[PDB]
């Protein structure tokens, strides 16, 4: 009784989820570059949050400069943005979809 | 007495799962149709954005992205900036007329 | 009942947000360079705030000069402005929009 | 007594969400129209800057 | 393509969080820079220290 009844709940829920994706798929066809841009702008700071957040756990950081070099904060902040920038170019290797609004392809 | 009781209550458990399943399916369906209207309307409005509007979206995202990038600097302690020559130049002038 | 009712709140709110963007999109078409300039001037000190703010947490800084070099405050202050200037040129790599009022493109 | 009570109060919760949703939509709409007037006027003035 | 991009954009934060987790264990970080040498220049006399 419980097994036969649960299969109906899965099926009822399945049909509703499928109509959600069907209407979401039709809506995505309207996303021109002016709309696609926002998808990147929303998830860029989120990717930076999950990369920077665990790095903020660091107890102490020390920066030393000499002669010709920069001070150092540029190197530190640079690595966060670099890991964030390296990621989309990394997933592209195991799936050809693009995370760069045209510009290249 | 044990059998009829267990069977009657098992049917109640099954009735609950089915009723809740159907109610949930109706909500998921309705919520999907409402969310699709957001996506459609947002798209039909965004498709009309000019370069000054596209620049506004980026200018609003920069402070957000900047704050998350700069957060680890809160842990900086010491910073020593040597400069001017590439050598260990310790020139210090002043006598110890009395120190042991 | 609560699910069916919430879908109406999402839909009612959706229609209002959409008319906001529609009228905001029409207004942006009037933003000539003399107006666009202010968008940069307002958000330049804000980007400097979120970059400089966490750097001010530093406990001690020491500057040493020798022979030919500058004193050092120029290097320190320079890095803040550099990270701020590096950012817009960095996002341009993952989306071709410009954060430089014409001058180049 | 438990069923009729729960149903009547669930309808009250749904009525509250709907009424609040509609009031909110009217405010968001009105606020958007006022904000667009700022953007338009600010633009029409800035366009004349020497 | 806009929908396919949405699926990836939703997966990036997920994949990013699991990759960055070990950084929570970072303690010290020392960033030397500017020259490739052991340059310890420090200036100031000990008028009274033993």
- Contact residues of D toward C, CB < 8 A: 10-11, 13-15, 17-18, 20-22, 24-26, 28-29, 31-33, 35-36, 39-40, 42-44, 46-49
Measured between beta carbons, the chain A residues lying within 8 angstroms of E17 are 50
Read off the DSSP letter of residue E39: -
Q: In sequence order, what are the residues at sequence separation of 6 or more whose Cβ sits closer than 8 angstroms to the Cβ of residue C26?
A: B48, D36
- What are the C-alpha distances in Å from C71 to residues B81, B82, B86, C58, E31? 9, 9, 14, 19, 20
Residue A70: closest C-alpha in chain E: E34
- Residues D24 and D36: their CA atoms lie apart, in Å, by 18
Which two structure tokens, joined as six digits, stand for C103? 């001058």
- Per the entry, the structure determination technique was cryo-EM
**Would you say D36 and C27 are in contact if contact means Cβ atoms under 8 Å apart?**
yes
CB contact under 8 A, C51 and B66: yes
A74 to C79: CB separation less than 8 angstroms, yes or no: yes
Residue whose structure tokens are 């990836």: E8
Residue with tokens 């899965």, as numbered in its chain:
A10
Measure Cα distances from B67 to B11, C16, C23, C31 in Å: 57, 31, 30, 27
Alpha-carbon gap, residue A66 to C63, rounded angstroms: 10
Residues on chain A touching C52 (C-beta within 8 angstroms): none
Distances A28 to A16, B53, C13, C95, E8 between C-alpha atoms, Å: 19, 21, 20, 19, 14
**Residue E16 to residue A55, Cβ atoms within 8 A:** no
CA distance A71 to A64: 7
Choose the mutation target among E45, E49, E50 for the interface with B, i.e. most B CBs under 10 Å. E45
Q: Are C102 and C31 in contact (CB under 8 A)?
A: no
Among candidates C15, E34, E16, which has minimal Cα distance to E8?
Answer: E16
Distances (CA, A) of D26 to B92, C14, C16, E3: 74, 11, 7, 31
Q: A100 to chain C: nearest residue by CA?
A: C94
Residues B48, A35: Cα–Cα separation, whole Å: 9
């Amino acid at each position: 009784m419980r097994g036969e009844a649960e299969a109906f709940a899965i099926g009822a829920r399945a049909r509703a989820e499928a109509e959600q994706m069907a209407k979401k798929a039709e809506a995505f066809q309207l996303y021109q570059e002016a709309a696609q841009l926002d998808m990147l702008l929303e998830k860029l700071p989120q990717v930076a949050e999950e990369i920077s957040g665990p790095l903020t756990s660091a107890n102490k950081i020390t920066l030393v400069s000499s002669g010709s070099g920069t001070m150092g904060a540029a190197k530190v902040t640079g690595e966060v943005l670099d890991i964030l920038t390296r990621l989309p170019e990394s997933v592209e290797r195991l799936t050809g979809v693009s995370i760069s609004q045209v510009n290249h392809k | 007495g044990e059998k009829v009781k267990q069977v009657l209550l098992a049917q109640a458990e099954a009735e609950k799962i089915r009723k809740i399943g159907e109610a949930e399916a109706a909500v998921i369906e309705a919520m999907g149709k409402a969310e699709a209207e957001r996506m459609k309307l947002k798209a039909e409005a965004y498709q009309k954005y000019g370069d000054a509007a596209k620049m506004a979206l980026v200018l609003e995202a920069l402070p957000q992205i900047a704050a998350k990038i700069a957060a680890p600097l809160t842990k900086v302690d010491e910073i020593v900036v040597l400069s001017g020559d590439n050598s260990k130049v310790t020139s210090e002038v002043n006598r110890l007329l009395a120190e042991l």
